[PDB]
């Protein structure tokens, strides 16, 4: 049961910090250049987390980075928190724009199954992925930092489109 600590580390280390300042950083980018107002976190339950989001789906294109967020943390001066903005194509048309990224601990969970010393078996990846997604959902429900500033996209994979899955959450948000 190591997915529980990873979910809390994901909140304590990442989301508790960037979410309060997130909507102010998006308004900064929009005024100089639109992008939706919340961060969309991808949660593939098969634990397949590609490093390059454009390879997962050609219709997901990188556009530009948000302004950086820096702070002194654990002895590191101005540790850099940056997020990438993606345009989601549909039938050759720009169907939306948002800040999109995977949940890094999912791949961190994936890599633990390879190492023998971790004691984490391959068969447990899906169960711990659901637990990570479920524990993260329970955290952000009571999290004061998250006031409708974050959206979690969880899915299981033989035809599938991540652009359509992301666009689904985008369209329903506009209502």
Total residues contacting ligand KAX by CB under 6 A comes to: 10
Q: Which does 93 bind (CB under 5 to 8 A by kind): ligand KAX, a second copy, none?
A: none
Burial level of 162, CB count in 10 A (0-12/13-18/19+)? Answer: buried
Asked if residues 126 and 46 have their Cβ atoms less than 8 Å apart, the reply is yes
Asked if residues 135 and 4 have their Cβ atoms less than 8 Å apart, the reply is yes
The residue (of 81 and 155) whose beta carbon lies closer to ligand KAX is 81
Phi and psi dihedrals of 32, rounded to 5? -90, -5
Residue from 137, 157, 140, 158 nearest 149 by CA: 140
Q: Which does 145 bind (CB under 5 to 8 A by kind): a second copy, ligand KAX, none?
A: none
Mask: binding to ligand KAX, 11-50, rule CB under 6 A, as x and -?
Answer: --xx------------------------------------
CB-based closest residue to ligand KAX = 13
CB of 175 to a second copy, least distance (A): 26
75 near ligand KAX, rule: CB under 6 A: no
CB of 10 to ligand KAX, least distance (A): 5
Cα(77)–Cα(95) distance, integer angstroms? 39
Cα(62)–Cα(44) distance, integer angstroms? 19
The pair of structure tokens assigned to 112 is 């633990």
The pair of structure tokens assigned to 47 is 């634990």
Q: Which does 175 bind (CB under 5 to 8 A by kind): ligand KAX, a second copy, none?
A: none
Asked if residues 151 and 166 have their Cβ atoms less than 8 Å apart, the reply is no
The residue (of 55 and 76) whose beta carbon lies closer to ligand KAX is 76
Cα 129 from chain centroid?
A: 14
Mask: binding to ligand KAX, 102-141, rule CB under 6 A, as x and -?
Answer: --xx--x---------------------------------
**Interacting residues with ligand KAX (CB under 6 A):** 9-10, 13-14, 76, 79, 81, 104-105, 108
């Amino acid at each position: 049961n190591v997915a529980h600590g990873l979910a809390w580390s994901y909140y304590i280390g990442y989301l508790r910090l960037i979410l309060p300042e997130l909507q102010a950083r998006i308004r900064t980018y929009n005024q100089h250049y639109a992008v939706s107002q919340r961060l969309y976190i991808l949660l593939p339950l098969d634990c397949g987390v590609p490093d390059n989001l454009s390879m997962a789906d050609p219709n997901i294109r990188f556009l530009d980075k948000l302004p950086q967020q820096t702070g002194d943390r654990a002895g590191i001066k101005d540790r850099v928190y940056s997020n990438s903005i993606y345009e989601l194509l549909e039938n050759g048309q720009r169907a939306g724009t948002c800040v999109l990224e995977y949940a890094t601990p999912l791949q961190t969970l994936f890599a633990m199954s390879q190492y023998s010393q971790a004691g984490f078996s391959r068969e447990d990846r899906l169960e711990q992925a659901k637990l990570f997604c479920r524990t993260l959902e329970d955290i952000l429900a009571d999290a004061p930092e998250s006031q409708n500033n974050c959206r979690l996209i969880a899915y299981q994979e033989s035809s599938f489109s991540l652009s359509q899955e992301v666009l689904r959450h985008l369209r329903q948000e506009e209502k």
